[PDB]
Design a protein around this ligand. Structure first.
Ligand SMILES: CC[C@@H]1/C=C(\C)[C@@H](O)[C@H](C)C[C@H](OC)[C@H]2O[C@@](O)(C(=O)C(=O)N3CCCC[C@H]3C(=O)O[C@H](/C(C)=C/[C@@H]3CC[C@@H](O)[C@H](OC)C3)[C@H](C)[C@@H](O)CC1=O)[C@H](C)C[C@@H]2OC
Length: 107
């Protein structure tokens, strides 16, 4: 599944609902620590809509647990990420992933 470990607290009140757009910054790394992506390096917040099957299960369920302003470490088992398939040339098969995610606002 997905573990959510808080880095910095959010408001504890405003949680994303199905049909709302989450605006986040994130960094993604493999379990061994190798960074593979960062919206911060891209200098553009990442947007996705909850309930629209847009993101890996670990995100769909992990970000749902966050409130606006919260920064958290999401540790995600391969089955809640890219599984045995992986993501060609980025995510190897059977990868546990770690995301640093900050929920900036809802739209
Ligand atoms: C068509 C291009 C389209 C690309 C964009 C909109 C880009 O602008 C984004 C900024 C994405 C990044 O582009 C540089 C890049 O992000 C990663 O690096 C990454 O950090 C990641 O893991 N993310 C992104 C942040 C949210 C969680 C997760 C994800 O869920 O991503 C989603 C994802 C890949 C879902 C799979 C869909 C197929 C299912 O079969 C599989 O089911 C297991 C899940 C992603 C947002 C898709 O909805 C949309 C796209 O892929 C991926 C390793 C590879 C991906 O590039 C492709």
């Amino acid at each position: 599944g997905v573990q959510v470990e808080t880095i910095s607290p959010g408001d504890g009140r405003t949680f994303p609902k199905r049909g709302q757009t989450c605006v986040v910054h994130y960094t993604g790394m493999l379990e061994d620590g190798k960074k593979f992506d960062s919206s911060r390096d891209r200098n553009k917040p990442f947007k996705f809509m909850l309930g629209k099957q847009e993101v890996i299960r670990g995100w769909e369920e992990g970000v749902a647990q966050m409130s606006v302003g919260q920064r958290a470490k999401l540790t995600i088992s391969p089955d809640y990420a890219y599984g045995a398939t992986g993501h060609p040339g980025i995510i190897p098969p059977h990868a546990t992933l770690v995301f640093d995610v900050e929920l900036l606002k809802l739209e």
